[PDB]
Amino acid sequence: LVPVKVPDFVRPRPPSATSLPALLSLFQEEWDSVALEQFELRRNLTETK
Amino acid sequence: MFCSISGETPKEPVISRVSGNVYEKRLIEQVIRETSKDPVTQQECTLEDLVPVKVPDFVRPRPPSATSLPALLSLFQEEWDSVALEQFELRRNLTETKQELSTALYSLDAALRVISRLTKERDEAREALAKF
Amino acid sequence: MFCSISGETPKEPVISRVSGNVYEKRLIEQVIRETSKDPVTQQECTLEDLVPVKVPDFVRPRPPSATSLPALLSLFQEEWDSVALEQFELRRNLTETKQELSTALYSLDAALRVISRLTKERDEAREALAK
Amino acid sequence: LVPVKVPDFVRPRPPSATSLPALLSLFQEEWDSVALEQFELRRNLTETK
Amino acid sequence: XXXXXXXXXXXXXXXXXXXXXXXXXXXXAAEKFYTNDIQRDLAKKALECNKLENRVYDLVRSSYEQRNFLIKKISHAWKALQTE
Amino acid sequence: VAAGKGEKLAAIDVQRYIQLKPPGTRESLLQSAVVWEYQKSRNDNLYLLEKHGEKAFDSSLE
């Protein structure tokens, strides 16, 4: 492998950013969005066959 | 976003596979035709070795945001790694205060035995002199 | 085994050459970027001074258990909730140990003023005894 | 040579089970599989399409 | 008037350090003062937060829309890509 | 993960920090002290954002 360099990527952390929403609301939505997508993606693979 | 050779915004970016860096195709092509090398590291590189920038394949991506699970996990490292240094500011300053308290309470314990003897001696000199 | 900044087990430890102390690469860099110094000895040290140490073997992964994953969410919640109070309790104690230290310094300097008047009462007594 | 153990102004935390920093490391390790699974599921999705 | 004196001061400093860690572990009358200290913080900090938020929001809700309406363009630029 | 998606139910998080209550007990003494440290971390987390401000946002917009 060969590592590449670029001008780096920047994400603007939201204005309502605290330990509280990042622990509770944001992290909850991320494991919801991972769960309901792959389940729905498994549903899409079953119908294609 | 930039081309490393010219400094412009490249309109046809092609990444090399010897020194990982985004070059403009038209610029890097002329650099290779001059001599078969990569401009940065001076390692050998041909035109077929260079590769255009592409959409990954079939997995759809989304832009780098605060929501995205990996960006959120690297955020929580920044939180804890900064708070760990906050603890050093209070551990190091505690080792100065308790060290100054230890020498202060020792000077207090060494001095108050001399206050107890002068209160004895000045009253004993008043007890002695007044009786005579 | 322990990096002397955070308290973690270092995953890419680096040692300072001005003072023999294995730090973690991330944490020592932030300190040098703040001020070019060593956190323990306060000696002039730089980023190029650091020598990356190798520790391939010690790395030992925690296998919490079969443990339900929805519960592991509430563990990480509780552990951040605990560390937030374990950082808070350690700072108010530092402020009150410095505060109670300042009360001793007033008594220390107030006492050595009271000895000066007591020495005068002894000096006045030694003059009267001679007469 | 730098001799002797290092712990000073640090407090000892023997590689603990219910600590904190490794929980985030564990959260990364399980996500690393989530991405690898989603790739192979999508390949077969589009390759069947 | 004031090796052996250095060790007796280090031992007494460890004893007072253990008494300071014992007075802290018992606490975690006094509870009402900490809650009011937070009500000052909650007031002072959240007023600063609401000022920082609304100042940011005014500048950044526009840049959010700018950034978020651009994200929706990837979702359509991708969806057409596959059909082609 | 498959059970959470099938059942259509997200696992409940810590709904504690936001509400709390004055004259509580040793339990709310902790809950109070939690609100302070996170509020101080919050007000420090809003300072480093406002310092850069809109420059860091519009750099990502590009």
Curated annotation (Swiss-Prot), chains A, D:
It comes from the Eukaryota. Disulfide bonds: none annotated. It is found in: Nucleus. Probable ubiquitin-protein ligase involved in pre-mRNA splicing. May also function in DNA repair. Belongs to the WD repeat PRP19 family. Homotetramer. Component of the NTC complex (or PRP19-associated complex), composed of at least CEF1, CLF1, ISY1, NTC20, SNT309, SYF1, SYF2, and PRP19. This is Pre-mRNA-processing factor 19. It comes from Schizosaccharomyces pombe (strain 972 / ATCC 24843) (Fission yeast). The lineage of its organism: Eukaryota, Fungi, Dikarya, Ascomycota, Taphrinomycotina.
Swiss-Prot record, chain E:
Signal peptide: none annotated. It is found in: Nucleus. It comes from the Eukaryota. Belongs to the 40S cdc5-associated complex (or cwf complex), a spliceosome sub-complex reminiscent of a late-stage spliceosome composed of the U2, U5 and U6 snRNAs and at least brr2, cdc5, cwf2/prp3, cwf3/syf1, cwf4/syf3, cwf5/ecm2, spp42/cwf6, cwf7/spf27, cwf8, cwf9, cwf10, cwf11, cwf12, prp45/cwf13, cwf14, cwf15, cwf16, cwf17, cwf18, cwf19, cwf20, cwf21, cwf22, cwf23, cwf24, cwf25, cwf26, cyp7/cwf27, cwf28, cwf29/ist3, lea1, msl1, prp5/cwf1, prp10, prp12/sap130, prp17, prp22, sap61, sap62, sap114, sap145, slu7, smb1, smd1, smd3, smf1, smg1 and syf2. Interacts with sde2. Involved in mRNA splicing and cell cycle control. Belongs to the CEF1 family. This is Pre-mRNA-splicing factor cdc5. The gene is cdc5. The chain holds residues 652 to 707 of 757 of the full protein.
UniProtKB/Swiss-Prot annotation, chain F:
It is found in: Nucleus. Belongs to the SPF27 family. Belongs to the 40S cdc5-associated complex (or cwf complex), a spliceosome sub-complex reminiscent of a late-stage spliceosome composed of the U2, U5 and U6 snRNAs and at least brr2, cdc5, cwf2/prp3, cwf3/syf1, cwf4/syf3, cwf5/ecm2, spp42/cwf6, cwf7/spf27, cwf8, cwf9, cwf10, cwf11, cwf12, prp45/cwf13, cwf14, cwf15, cwf16, cwf17, cwf18, cwf19, cwf20, cwf21, cwf22, cwf23, cwf24, cwf25, cwf26, cyp7/cwf27, cwf28, cwf29/ist3, lea1, msl1, prp5/cwf1, prp10, prp12/sap130, prp17, prp22, sap61, sap62, sap114, sap145, slu7, smb1, smd1, smd3, smf1, smg1 and syf2. Involved in mRNA splicing. This is Pre-mRNA-splicing factor cwf7. It comes from Schizosaccharomyces pombe (strain 972 / ATCC 24843) (Fission yeast). The lineage of its organism: Eukaryota, Fungi, Dikarya, Ascomycota, Taphrinomycotina. The chain holds residues 64 to 125 of 187 of the full protein.
